[PDB]
Amino acid sequence: GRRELIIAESEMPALMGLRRKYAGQQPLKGAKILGCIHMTIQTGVLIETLVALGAEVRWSSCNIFSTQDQAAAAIAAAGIPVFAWKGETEEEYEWCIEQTILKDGQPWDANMVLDDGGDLTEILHKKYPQMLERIHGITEETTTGVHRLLDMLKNGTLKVPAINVNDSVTKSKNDNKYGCRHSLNDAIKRGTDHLLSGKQALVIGYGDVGKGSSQSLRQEGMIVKVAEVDPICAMQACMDGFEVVSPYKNGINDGTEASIDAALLGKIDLIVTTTGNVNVCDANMLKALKKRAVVCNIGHFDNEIDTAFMRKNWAWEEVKPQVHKIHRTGKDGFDAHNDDYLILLAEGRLVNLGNATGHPSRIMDGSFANQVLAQIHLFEQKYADLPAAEKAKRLSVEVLPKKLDEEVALEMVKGFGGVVTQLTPKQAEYIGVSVEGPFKPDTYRY
Amino acid sequence: AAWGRRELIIAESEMPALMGLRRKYAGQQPLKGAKILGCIHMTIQTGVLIETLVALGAEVRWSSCNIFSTQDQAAAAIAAAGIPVFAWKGETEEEYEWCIEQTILKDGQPWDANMVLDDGGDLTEILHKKYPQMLERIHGITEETTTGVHRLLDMLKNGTLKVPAINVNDSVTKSKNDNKYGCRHSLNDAIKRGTDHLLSGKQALVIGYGDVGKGSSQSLRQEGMIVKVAEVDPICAMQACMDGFEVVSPYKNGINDGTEASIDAALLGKIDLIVTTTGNVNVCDANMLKALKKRAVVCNIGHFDNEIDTAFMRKNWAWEEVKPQVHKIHRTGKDGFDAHNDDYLILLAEGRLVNLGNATGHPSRIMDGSFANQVLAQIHLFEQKYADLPAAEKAKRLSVEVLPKKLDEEVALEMVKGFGGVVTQLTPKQAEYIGVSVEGPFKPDTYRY
Amino acid sequence: GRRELIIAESEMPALMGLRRKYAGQQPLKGAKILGCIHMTIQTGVLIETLVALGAEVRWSSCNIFSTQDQAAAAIAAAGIPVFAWKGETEEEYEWCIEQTILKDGQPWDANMVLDDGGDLTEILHKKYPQMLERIHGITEETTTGVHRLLDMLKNGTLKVPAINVNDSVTKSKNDNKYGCRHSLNDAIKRGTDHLLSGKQALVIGYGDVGKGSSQSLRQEGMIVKVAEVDPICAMQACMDGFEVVSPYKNGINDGTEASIDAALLGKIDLIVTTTGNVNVCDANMLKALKKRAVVCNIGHFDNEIDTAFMRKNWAWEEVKPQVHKIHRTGKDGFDAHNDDYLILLAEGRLVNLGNATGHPSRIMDGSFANQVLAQIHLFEQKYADLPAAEKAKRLSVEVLPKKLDEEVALEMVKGFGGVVTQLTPKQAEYIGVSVEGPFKPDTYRY
Amino acid sequence: DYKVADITLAAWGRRELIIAESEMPALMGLRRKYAGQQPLKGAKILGCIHMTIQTGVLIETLVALGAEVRWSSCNIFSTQDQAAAAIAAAGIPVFAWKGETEEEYEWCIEQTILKDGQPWDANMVLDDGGDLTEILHKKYPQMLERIHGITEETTTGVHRLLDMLKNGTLKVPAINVNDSVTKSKNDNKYGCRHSLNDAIKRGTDHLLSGKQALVIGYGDVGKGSSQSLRQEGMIVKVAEVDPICAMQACMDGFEVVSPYKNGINDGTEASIDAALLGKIDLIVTTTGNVNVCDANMLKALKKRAVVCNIGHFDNEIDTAFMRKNWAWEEVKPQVHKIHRTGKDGFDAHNDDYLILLAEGRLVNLGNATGHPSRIMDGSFANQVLAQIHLFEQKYADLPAAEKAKRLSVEVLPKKLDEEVALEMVKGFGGVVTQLTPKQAEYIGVSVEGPFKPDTYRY
Ligand SMILES: NC(=O)c1ccc[n+]([C@@H]2O[C@H](COP(=O)([O-])OP(=O)(O)OC[C@H]3O[C@@H](n4cnc5c(N)ncnc54)[C@H](O)[C@@H]3O)[C@@H](O)[C@H]2O)c1
Ligand SMILES: NC(=O)c1ccc[n+]([C@@H]2O[C@H](COP(=O)([O-])OP(=O)(O)OC[C@H]3O[C@@H](n4cnc5c(N)ncnc54)[C@H](O)[C@@H]3O)[C@@H](O)[C@H]2O)c1
Ligand SMILES: NC(=O)c1ccc[n+]([C@@H]2O[C@H](COP(=O)([O-])OP(=O)(O)OC[C@H]3O[C@@H](n4cnc5c(N)ncnc54)[C@H](O)[C@@H]3O)[C@@H](O)[C@H]2O)c1
Ligand SMILES: NC(=O)c1ccc[n+]([C@@H]2O[C@H](COP(=O)([O-])OP(=O)(O)OC[C@H]3O[C@@H](n4cnc5c(N)ncnc54)[C@H](O)[C@@H]3O)[C@@H](O)[C@H]2O)c1
Ligand SMILES: Nc1ncnc2c1ncn2[C@@H]1O[C@H](CO)[C@@H](O)[C@H]1O
C-alpha cells in the first residue's frame, strides 16, 4: 500500500518540508476534501494533513479517468474509501452525470475538491448559490491555463475570489530553463546512438526550448547555427556563442527556390525545430541538404515541418521504430542507398509522447506545493464573513503572490543542502522590503 | 582638436545601431525643428550619439552631469564645432551647478525648446523648482536611471508633475545588454590587469545572484574557477543550484547577531577572492574579513562603497598603495607593517566599481544598444504633436510610460546586422496565424526573456 | 548479415578510405599472409581491405571465447568455411594448429604473418622452422605478448622482424579521450535516472580516463572532486578547475578509524573509482560516508573498493537490476524504511554483463587501420636480397613509425569535411621534414 | 652597472616579486633545501630569456644560491619595464629598457658575451630561442673550450641546437628541459590560454562574442590559443598541416579550412579562395614557420581585420611586402593602422584598412605582460635541477676519449619532475595520497620512485 508512497516520499522536498514545518499549529480546520485531478501514484500525497481534511476523499475524479487501478492496493488507510476505476469499459455517465456532486458535496459546506476546471464554475456554484460571503471550502484554485480567467466570472455575478496557482515563477523555470532539459537529450542521447562531435547542425528558433537545446549540443561538441524572426532572441543568440543565419536568401522569403542560400543548406545533417509556427521548414529547404539529414521536431504541436506533400513524393520507409529513411532523389532503384535518403529522428511528433512514455514526478513538486499553500493565503482572514460594503473593495483576480513562491523555493534550496541568509532589520528597511519578503515586484524578469 | 576626431572615427564603426539611423530614415528627417537640451556625460560614445542626433535635422545643446567624469581632450572637438561644453573640472567645484545654469537660461526671455535628454540629473531642482510654468513648450523628458523612474512616478502620484516623460531602463535591449553581458566581458579584464593571477584552480565567493550576479558567475567559471553563491532571495538562490554552483552563507545557520561566534570559519578559510554584486549595506562585515584566508582579493561591482566595509579598515588595518587599482591592507594593525610579512590583503580599487577603475567597461558595442533607445524616444515624442492637441487633453496624457516594444526591436535589429547575421521575415499567412503582425512585436508585455 | 556489413562499412571511414585510395597500386602483389585475430565484425572488413590490394590471405581460429555462432550466417556467402567454439575447448586447439597450418600433408610458406595473442609465433619454428628463415616480418596485436616477443628476440629463437600495432597516438586519442567518455553517462542514467545538477561527487584517479569522467560530470551541474597519487596528474587536475582531496588525514592510511576525514565524506553523494589499484576505498571510509550515497567503479579490477565487507558484516537486497541496496544497520535488524543505507551500481565490477551497452563498434577501427600500413611497410624491403651482415641491423623490433600514423589521421579529417594545407618546397627545408614524411620526432608527446 | 630611464621603476618590481615568490612555491621551496649546502658553487651561466617579472626570481635565486650570471633581453618587445629594473637594482648587470630597434637587439645579445672589451669566461649557457647559442658558436669558437653546458627553453631553439650536432659543429653538451612534462604540457599550453585573449582585448577592445577568427596551427600553442578564443564566444577556425593535430582540432569541436583552395599554394590569384576569407575579422599565426600569410592572402581579406602573431619569429606574416606598398599609420603604441589603397595616398575616412598587432612579433609580450607566475613555476625548477646536474661534471676537464660519450644532449629523469609537480600541487591546497606498502607490490613501483614508464605521454 504505502510502499508506493515510500518510493518517492521525501523525493519531493517541498511538500515534505511543508509537512515538517506545519506539523504544529495546524491550519485548514474547516472543510472536507474530495479531489478530482488525475490520481497518479505521485498525486495522492497532496492531502498533506489528512486530519485537517475530509480523510475520506474518495477522489471524486470529475475529469476523465482520473482514478487508477493502484488505488485499491494503495489507499487502504482508516476511513478513506476509494473507487479504483480506470477507463470507460462500463458506463461513465452513471457516476459522472449522476456524480456525488450532490451526494458527497452536501450543501452544508465542509467539502472541497481543489480540482482543474472548477467543475462547472457558474452552473456549479449556482446550484447552491449561498456559499458567497460564507467561504468555507473551495475558492476556485484550478491551475488550467486553458481556463485562464473565464471572463464569465467577471462580467457575471460570480464574484467569489479566485487565485489560480498556475503561471507562477518557479513553475515555468523548473520546466524550461532547467530541470526537464532531457528534451533533446532523448534523441541526441542514445536515440540516434551516434557521436555528434565535429558535425554541423541547424536549430530554428531561440525561445526557452531553443535556449535549452543549444547549450547541450555545444557542450556535446557540435557546430550549431541559429535562426530567428524576433530581433531580441536573435541578439541573444549572437551574444552567447552562435552565429545567426536564415535559410532564405538575403532575408526575404517570397516565391521560389531562388530565394534560399544553397551553400549552408548542403552541409547540415541535423535539424531541430524549437518553433510553434506553421511552415518553419517547408518543402523548400529539404530540397537542399547534405545527402543525409536527421529531423527531430521538438516544437509544440505537429503542424511544423512539411505538409501533406512529403508523404507522397518522398517514401517514408521504416527500418527502426521512431526512425525512417525518407528518400530525396531515389527515383526507382528500390534501394535508396546512394546517399539519397533522410532519417526521421522522431516519428514526426513530440518526442515526449512518441519516444517517451513515463515522466519524472519532480516537475510537479513545485506545482502541488504552491497549490496546497494557497489555501492558507486564503482561509486565514476569510473576509467573506464580513459586511458586503468591504466585499467589493478588494474584488479582483490575481495570480499567486511572490511570498507563496519564495517559501516554496526555500524548501528546494535546502533540499540539496544549502543555507539562505536572513536579512537583518536594518537591511530590510533600507531597500524597502520586509524581512520575511517579498523582495521583488511583478515586473522583474529574473 | 583634430586628434579627437581621429579617436572618434575608429570607434564609430563599432556601433551599427546609431549609424543605421542616419540612413534608415535618410531624407525623411522626422526630427525636423526639434530643440533638445541635454546633460549627458561628454564621452567618445556620446559624441557618436549627438552626431547621430544632428544628422536627423535636430539641434542639441549639452553640458556636464558629474564634472568629475570627463575626457578633457574630447571637449576640444565639440568646442571647435561650436556647442558649448564645460567638461573641464572646476578648480573650486563651484562650476558643478554654475555651468548647468548657463546652458538652460539664455538672455532674459524664454526660448522655444521642446525636448530634454537628461541623465539622472537634478533638472527638477532647476526647471521644475524655479520656473515650472516654462514646461508649456517642452513635450517630453528622457531619463535612463533605474531609480529616477520611481521618483518620477511618485511625483506623478503627488500631482506636482507638469509634463510627461518616458524612461528607457525597463527595456530588454538595455537590461540584458548593460547588466548581464559586459560584466561577463569586463570582470576578467578587471581582475587580470591588476593582479595577473592564474584564476584556474582558485576559489571565489560571490555575494548576490542578480543581473550582475549571473554575468559575474559566468565570467569566473569560463576561466576555470570554483565559485560559491550567497543569496537572500530563495528564487534567485534556486537558480544558483541549477547553474552548477553551491549555496552557502558566511553565518552559522544564517543568523547574524554581531558576535564573533556566528561566523563559519571553515568556509571562509579557503576563499581566494571575494566580490559583491548587490545594492544593500554590509553584505560583508568586518567579521567575514577575520576568517578569510590570508592574501585575499576584494572586489566591488555594486553601487556605493557601503556594500562592503571600508570605514573599519581605515581605522584598524594598515593601508598601502602602488597603483590606483590595487591596495595593500594588513590584517595586524595600523601601527606598522613589514615589507615581507604575509598578513596583508589586496583590494581592487578603494571599494568602488572595478569596471570603471580597470578598463572602459562595455567598450563600444554593448553600449550601442543602450544609446539607441534614447534617440528612438525623441522621435516618438515629436510624432505625438503635443502642440496640436488642445489644452483639455493635456491633463489626460500626463503620465509615466516606457518605450513600446515595437520601438525596442528596431534597436536590436541593427545590432544583429552588425555581426553579419540575417533575420527572417514572416510571410503574411504565417504572421496572422500566430496572432502578431509582420512588423508588430511578437510577444506580450509580461514575457520573461 | 548483409545489413550489418553496410552499417559497419559506413561507420569506419579509415578502412574504406584506404580501400578507395590505394586501389590501383596494389602493394600486396607478392605477399603470402595467413592471419587469425579475435573474431569480430571488423575482422571481416579488415580481411576485405587486406585482400583488395592483392594479398593472398588465409584465415583460421586461434581464440576460443572470441568465436560466435551468429557469424555463420555472414560467412555463408563467402566460399571459405570457418570454425567457431562456444567455451574453453582447449583440447580442440591441437586440431586447429594441425589442420590450418598443414594444408595437404606438406609444409607451407608465408612471407609475412599477422596473428593475435602473441603465442602462435613459437608454433611456426616449433613445427616447420625450415621456411621460417624466409619470412619478412611479424605483426601481432596482443597485450603483454610484446614482452614475450622481445624476450625471445633477446633469446634468439624466432629470427624474424616484428612491429606492434597497439602503441599509437591515433589509437589513444580516439578511445582514451573520446571512447571511454561513454559509459559514465550511461551508467549514471541507468542508476539514478534523474536530474543531478547541484549535488556533489568524488572521482578517484586522474590519469587518462579520470579526465573524461571528470569533464562529463561538470557540464551536468555537479561539483566534482578528484583524488590522486601521481603529482603530475594532480597538477593537470588543478589547472582544469577541480579540487584535490584525500579520504585519509594527511594522506596517510594508518588502517585505524581515527585517520579518516569524515567531514568531507559526510557531504558526498557519489563515489566514482577509475584507478586499477587495491583498497583505494577501504571499509573504514565506506562506513563514514553519508546516507543514500551511490558507489560505482569504471576502473579495471573488481577489487578496488573494499567489497565483501558489506556482504559479510552487513546485509544486501535487490533493486532495479544493476542496483543493490546495502543497509548500514549491521547483519540483520531494520525497520520498513530506515535511513542508513548505501547503493551499489555494479558491485565494483564491469558493466559488460548488461548494465550498459558499452563502447560502440568504432573502437576496433582505430587499431585495425594501422595493421594494413604495418603490413605494407614491412613488405617493401627485400629480405631475400639483404646479406647476413646487414640482417643484424634488420633483426630488431620497433613500434609503428610516425609516417604511418599521419596517413591514418588524414582520412579522418576529410571524413567530417575538411582540407589539409600542403607545404611549399621552401618551407619544408626550413623545418627539416620532407613534404610527404613524418612531421614530428619520436619524443613528441602531443 | 645598469642603464634605465628612471631608478624609481624598480620599486614596483620588488612588490610584484614578493607576490611572485608567495605564488611560486616550488622554486622557493627547493631554494631552502639547497640553501645550506650550496651544491652548484662555482657555476657560470649566461642567460638570454624574456625578462618578465616571473623571470627575475630565477636570476635572484641563482645569484643568492652561489652563482654569477649575466642576462639580456630576447626580443624588441619582450621585457617588462618594472621587471628589468628589479633585477638591475640587485646588482646583476643587465641591459633592458623601453623602446628598442632591430639594430639595437644584436648589440645587447653580444654585450653579455663581452666584458669591458675583453671576452668573458663562462661554463654554462641558458639560452632561449637559440640566438645566444649560435652567435658565439661561430663568431667566437674559442669560448666553447671552457663552456660545457647549454640549457634551452623553447621548442624552436632545440631544433637549431640539434641541427648543429648532425653537422658536427656542436661541441658542448646540452640539457633538453623543454621535453619535461612540467614544461611542455604546462608552460606553452595554458600560458597562451590565459594571455592571448588578454593581449587581444587590451589592444583593440573589440567585443569578441559573435565574431569570427582564424588560427593557423594546432600544436601546443594552438590548443591553448583556440580555447582562449572559444571561451569568450568567438567562432574560430583552425588550419593545420599535420593530420594528427587536425584530428585533435576536429574532435574538440572546431572546423578545419585552408586559405588556398584544395590546399595547393602556387602564387597565383586563383589559388586564394576569396569567399571564405571574406568573413574573417581576426587571424592568428601559431606555426613558427616562414611565410604562412602571403601577399595573395593578406590583400584578399575582409575589410578591417586584425592581424596578430604568437610565433617566435617574424616570418609568419609577410610584413615586408605591405611595408613598402601600403601606407602605415599608428593608432596607439604597439598597434598600427595600414591603408591598402596605395603607397602614399590615403585619407582618415578610408573604408579599406587593416590593423596590425605587435608588427608581427609576439603579441602576448607586446600588448600584455605574458604568462602568469604559477605557469612559469614548472619550468624554472627544471632549469635549476638541470643546471646543478651538469655543472658538477665539468665536461671541459674530462678526458678526450671520454668526450665521445659525454658530448650529447640529455634530459632530466622523471623523479625530479615528480618532485616539482608535488611541490607545486601542495601550494594549491591539495593533498596527495601516500601509498601503503601493500600498494607497491601491485602497481609495480616503489613508494617514492617513479610512477609511469617513459613511453607514457600523459
Ligand atoms: N519543453 C516543453 O515542455 C514545452 C512545452 C510547450 C511549449 N514549449 C515550447 O517552448 C517554447 C518557448 O516559447 P517562447 O515564447 O520562448 O518561443 P516561441 O513560442 O515564440 O517559439 C518560436 C521561437 O522562434 C521564433 N519564431 C517564430 N516563428 C518562427 C518562424 N516561422 N521561423 C523561425 N523562427 C520563428 C520566435 O521568435 C521564438 O523565439 C515555445 O516554442 C513552445 O512551443 C515547450
Ligand atoms: N558596476 C556596474 O557595471 C553596474 C552595472 C549595473 C548595475 N550596477 C549597480 O549595481 C547594483 C547591481 O544591480 P542588479 O541588477 O544586480 O540588482 P538586482 O536587483 O537585480 O539584484 C541584487 C540582488 O542582491 C540580493 N541581495 C540583497 N541583499 C543581499 C544580502 N544581504 N545577501 C545576499 N543577497 C542580497 C537580492 O536578493 C538581489 O537578488 C545596482 O545597485 C546597480 O545600480 C552596477
Ligand atoms: N573502458 C574501461 O573501463 C577501460 C579502458 C582502458 C583501460 N582500462 C583499465 O583502467 C585501468 C587504469 O588505467 P587507465 O586506463 O584508467 O589509466 P591510468 O593508468 O593512466 O590511470 C591510473 C591512475 O590511477 C592513479 N592511482 C593509482 N593508485 C592510486 C591510489 N591509491 N590513489 C589514487 N590514485 C591512484 C595513478 O596515479 C594514475 O593516474 C587499467 O588497468 C586499464 O586496463 C579500463
Ligand atoms: N609565449 C610564446 O610566445 C611562446 C611559447 C611557447 C612556444 N612559442 C613558440 O611556438 C612555436 C611552436 O610551438 P609548439 O611547441 O606548439 O610547436 P609544435 O611543433 O608543437 O606545433 C606547431 C605546429 O605548427 C604546424 N605547422 C608548421 N608549418 C605549418 C604550415 N605550413 N601549415 C600549417 N601548420 C603548420 C605544425 O604542424 C605543428 O603542429 C615555436 O616557434 C615556439 O618558439 C611561443
Ligand atoms: N613570462 C615568461 N617569462 C619567460 N619566458 C616565458 C614567459 N612566458 C613564456 N615564456 C617562454 O617564452 C618562449 C617563447 O616566447 C617559450 O619557451 C615560453 O615558455
CSV table of N, CA and C in Angstrom, one decimal, chain C residues 322-357:
chain,number,residue,atom,x,y,z
C,322,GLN,N,20.7,-3.7,-12.0
C,322,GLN,CA,22.1,-3.3,-11.7
C,322,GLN,C,22.1,-2.2,-10.6
C,323,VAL,N,21.3,-2.4,-9.6
C,323,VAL,CA,21.3,-1.6,-8.4
C,323,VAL,C,21.1,-2.5,-7.2
C,324,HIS,N,22.0,-2.3,-6.2
C,324,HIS,CA,21.9,-3.1,-4.9
C,324,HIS,C,21.8,-2.2,-3.7
C,325,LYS,N,20.9,-2.5,-2.8
C,325,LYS,CA,20.7,-1.7,-1.6
C,325,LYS,C,21.4,-2.4,-0.4
C,326,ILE,N,22.3,-1.7,0.2
C,326,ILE,CA,23.1,-2.2,1.3
C,326,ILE,C,22.8,-1.4,2.5
C,327,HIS,N,22.3,-2.1,3.6
C,327,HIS,CA,21.8,-1.4,4.8
C,327,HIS,C,22.9,-1.4,5.8
C,328,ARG,N,23.1,-0.2,6.4
C,328,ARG,CA,24.2,0.0,7.4
C,328,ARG,C,23.9,-0.4,8.8
C,329,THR,N,22.7,-0.9,9.0
C,329,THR,CA,22.3,-1.3,10.4
C,329,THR,C,23.2,-2.4,10.9
C,330,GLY,N,23.6,-3.4,10.1
C,330,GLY,CA,24.6,-4.4,10.5
C,330,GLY,C,24.0,-5.8,10.6
C,331,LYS,N,24.4,-6.7,9.7
C,331,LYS,CA,24.0,-8.1,9.8
C,331,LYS,C,22.5,-8.3,9.5
C,332,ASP,N,21.7,-7.9,10.5
C,332,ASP,CA,20.3,-8.0,10.5
C,332,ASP,C,19.6,-7.0,11.4
C,333,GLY,N,18.3,-6.8,11.2
C,333,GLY,CA,17.6,-5.9,12.1
C,333,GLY,C,17.4,-4.5,11.5
C,334,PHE,N,16.2,-4.2,10.9
C,334,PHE,CA,15.9,-3.0,10.3
C,334,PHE,C,14.4,-2.8,10.2
C,335,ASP,N,14.0,-1.5,10.1
C,335,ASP,CA,12.6,-1.2,10.0
C,335,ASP,C,12.1,-1.2,8.6
C,336,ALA,N,10.9,-0.7,8.3
C,336,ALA,CA,10.3,-0.7,7.0
C,336,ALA,C,11.2,0.2,6.0
C,337,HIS,N,11.5,1.4,6.4
C,337,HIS,CA,12.2,2.3,5.6
C,337,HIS,C,13.6,2.6,6.1
C,338,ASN,N,13.8,3.1,7.3
C,338,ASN,CA,15.0,3.5,7.9
C,338,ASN,C,15.7,4.6,7.1
C,339,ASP,N,16.9,4.9,7.5
C,339,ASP,CA,17.7,6.0,6.8
C,339,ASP,C,19.1,5.6,6.5
C,340,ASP,N,19.7,4.6,7.2
C,340,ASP,CA,21.1,4.3,7.0
C,340,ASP,C,21.2,3.2,5.9
C,341,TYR,N,21.6,3.5,4.7
C,341,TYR,CA,21.8,2.5,3.7
C,341,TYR,C,22.6,3.2,2.5
C,342,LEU,N,23.3,2.4,1.8
C,342,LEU,CA,24.1,2.8,0.6
C,342,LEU,C,23.4,2.1,-0.6
C,343,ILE,N,24.0,2.5,-1.8
C,343,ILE,CA,23.5,1.9,-3.1
C,343,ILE,C,24.7,1.6,-3.9
C,344,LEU,N,24.7,0.4,-4.4
C,344,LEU,CA,25.8,-0.1,-5.4
C,344,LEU,C,25.2,0.0,-6.8
C,345,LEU,N,26.1,0.1,-7.8
C,345,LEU,CA,25.8,0.1,-9.2
C,345,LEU,C,26.2,-1.1,-9.9
C,346,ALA,N,27.5,-1.6,-9.7
C,346,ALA,CA,28.0,-2.8,-10.3
C,346,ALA,C,28.8,-3.6,-9.4
C,347,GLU,N,28.6,-3.5,-8.1
C,347,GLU,CA,29.4,-4.1,-7.0
C,347,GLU,C,30.9,-4.1,-7.3
C,348,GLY,N,31.3,-3.0,-7.9
C,348,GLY,CA,32.7,-2.8,-8.3
C,348,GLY,C,33.1,-3.5,-9.5
C,349,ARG,N,32.2,-4.2,-10.2
C,349,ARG,CA,32.6,-5.0,-11.4
C,349,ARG,C,32.3,-4.2,-12.7
C,350,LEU,N,32.5,-4.9,-13.8
C,350,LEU,CA,32.3,-4.2,-15.1
C,350,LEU,C,30.8,-4.1,-15.4
C,351,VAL,N,30.5,-3.3,-16.5
C,351,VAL,CA,29.1,-3.1,-16.9
C,351,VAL,C,28.8,-3.9,-18.2
C,352,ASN,N,29.7,-4.8,-18.5
C,352,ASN,CA,29.6,-5.6,-19.7
C,352,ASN,C,28.5,-6.7,-19.6
C,353,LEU,N,28.1,-7.0,-18.3
C,353,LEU,CA,27.2,-8.0,-18.1
C,353,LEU,C,25.8,-7.7,-18.6
C,354,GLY,N,25.5,-6.4,-18.9
C,354,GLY,CA,24.2,-6.0,-19.3
C,354,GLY,C,23.8,-4.6,-18.8
C,355,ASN,N,24.6,-4.1,-17.8
C,355,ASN,CA,24.3,-2.8,-17.2
C,355,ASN,C,24.3,-1.7,-18.3
C,356,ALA,N,25.3,-1.7,-19.2
C,356,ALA,CA,25.4,-0.7,-20.2
C,356,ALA,C,25.7,-1.3,-21.5
C,357,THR,N,25.3,-0.6,-22.6
C,357,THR,CA,25.5,-1.1,-23.9
C,357,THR,C,27.0,-1.2,-24.3
